Amino acid sequence: MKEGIHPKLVPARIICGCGNVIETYSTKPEIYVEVCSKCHPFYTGQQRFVDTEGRVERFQRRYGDS
Amino acid sequence: GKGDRRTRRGKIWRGTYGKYRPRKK
């Protein structure tokens, strides 16, 4: 890397809905991230929270008992 | 507005009652 006009890239910290990613090693140390999927909410480390498919399911169940 | 049923003023127009125009005098 030519010397000048370049980000420092110094060991970092970082955060989330989870704890730290202590890998770090970035520009601009100590960053705060919204939330991740990995850290396993939201897809990876599959929760399938909030989940769908009721619409074909529904008008079956309630329907002829009501 | 008189057309927004999700308001006080709207329901009054439509003549109806509900969560946005409950009946207690």
Partner: protein, 81 residues
């Protein structure tokens, strides 16, 4: 909506429930579009009426609560020009 409810017409409601345990399945002409469809209807072949004629309709699971006259439309369009 209804709920304390579930209105189907006895006319075919019978003839479908019959074709349940007989073991046989056939093509049934109804004038009742007011009634609801499924689950013991599903897989059967019903001819609904549009006011003009009897129209074949295949039944399936996602046809669930839909009144029989949905799947048999009344007027004719084909664009303007």
């Amino acid at each position: 909506s209804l709920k304390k409810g579930v209105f189907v017409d006895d006319h075919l409601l019978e003839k479908v429930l019959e074709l349940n345990a007989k073991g046989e399945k056939r093509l049934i002409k109804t004038w009742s579009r007011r009634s609801t469809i499924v689950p013991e209807m599903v897989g059967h072949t019903i001819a609904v009426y549009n006011g003009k004629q009897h129209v074949p309709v295949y039944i399936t699971e996602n046809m669930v609560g839909h009144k029989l006259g949905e799947f048999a439309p009344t007027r004719t369009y084909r664009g303007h020009g």
